[PDB]
Design a protein around this ligand. Structure first.
Ligand code: 00L
Ligand code: NA
Ligand code: NA
Lengths: 10, 27, 250
């Protein structure tokens, strides 16, 4: 149920 | 150096809703 | 947290989220102690009994949060770890003795209204505050019941006498541990719960008005059961190891 985080974070 | 002094509480001299419970216990 | 309340904005600016990259999920709480160091429970990273061994690429640390699930755009800062440091004599085999770990960030994070470090205790701060009866505060996005909150939760609980702590359980209790909670009698509740692990137990000094981290959420049996107490890693007893890695390792 976690809102997705910005890819540069991956 | 600035550790533990909260920008929105200590630094403004505002107290949170329950910090006094803490303080009141240190007798 | 059980029997807690939503935290206010910027109430625990040292509060950190241990977050798994894949699947994306909350792992544990943690605390910001400088702009490049985070403090946690060693068991959040390594616990063989449960097949838990995380390394630096496995995780992301999220600072400045309030909301448990929402990606707080323009508020929260998400960093990468450069290194994990576990206490060499952490006992995951018997009783989580020495449950402490340091994490070094890829880069120093910048302070703000929502992001600010907590103080580590010194010998006398510890002497005068770590007293049965005195209260500390625990924070976390952990379970509400032995659900999951929408925002950070907080609770204030008294430090309990060591004997009382020993007598509540069958697990062997060491000097690197303290327990906290109210007595069944005392009628007032609350505790930490699953998902709170590795967060801070802090106290506000009445001398200088600063907030010091005295403990790390470590373990317990159930949550908020009568005659049962929460157990925290005693940060001051492990400070030498902490001082120590920060100078060797930067
Ligand atoms: C902690 O939050 C934790 O590690 N949760 C698992 C990771 C997780 C993340 C997100 C959601 C859920 C879980 C708990 C904190 C409990 C505090 N409880 C109270 N104050 N009442 N830590 C934890 O469960 C530890 C880790 C290993 N477990 C073994 C079984 C224990 N229940 C008791 C125990 C301790 C030492 C040795 C043997 C047994 C236990 O707490 N833990
Ligand atoms: Na016992
Ligand atoms: Na209890």
């Amino acid at each position: 149920d976690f809102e997705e985080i910005p890819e540069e974070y991956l | 150096a600035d550790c533990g002094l909260r920008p929105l509480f200590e630094k403004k001299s505002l107290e949170d809703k329950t910090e006094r419970e803490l303080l009141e216990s240190y007798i | 947290i059980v029997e807690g309340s939503d935290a206010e904005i910027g109430m625990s600016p040292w509060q950190v989220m241990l977050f798994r990259k894949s699947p994306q999920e909350l792992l544990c709480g943690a605390s910001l102690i400088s702009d490049r160091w985070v403090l946690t429970a060693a068991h959040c990273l390594l616990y063989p009994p449960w097949d838990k061994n995380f390394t630096e690429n496995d995780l992301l640390v999220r600072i400045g949060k309030h909301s448990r699930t929402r990606y707080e755009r323009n508020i929260e800062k998400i960093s990468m770890l450069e290194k994990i440091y576990i206490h060499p004599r952490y006992n995951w085999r018997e009783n989580l003795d020495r449950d402490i770990a340091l994490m070094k960030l890829k880069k120093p994070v910048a302070f703000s209204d929502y992001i600010h470090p907590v103080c580590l205790p010194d010998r006398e701060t510890a002497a005068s505050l770590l007293q049965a009866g005195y209260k500390g505060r625990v924070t976390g996005w952990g379970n509400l019941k032995e659900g999951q909150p929408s925002v950070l939760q907080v609770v204030n609980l008294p430090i309990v006498e060591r004997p009382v702590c020993k007598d509540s359980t069958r697990i062997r209790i060491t000097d690197n541990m303290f327990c906290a909670g109210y007595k069944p009698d005392e009628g007032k509740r609350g505790d930490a719960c699953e998902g709170d692990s590795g967060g801070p137990f802090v106290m506000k000094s009445p001398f200088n008005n600063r907030w010091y981290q005295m403990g790390i959420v470590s373990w317990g049996e159930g949550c908020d059961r009568d005659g049962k107490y929460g157990f925290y890693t005693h940060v001051f007893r492990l400070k030498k190891w902490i001082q120590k890695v920060i100078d060797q390792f930067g």
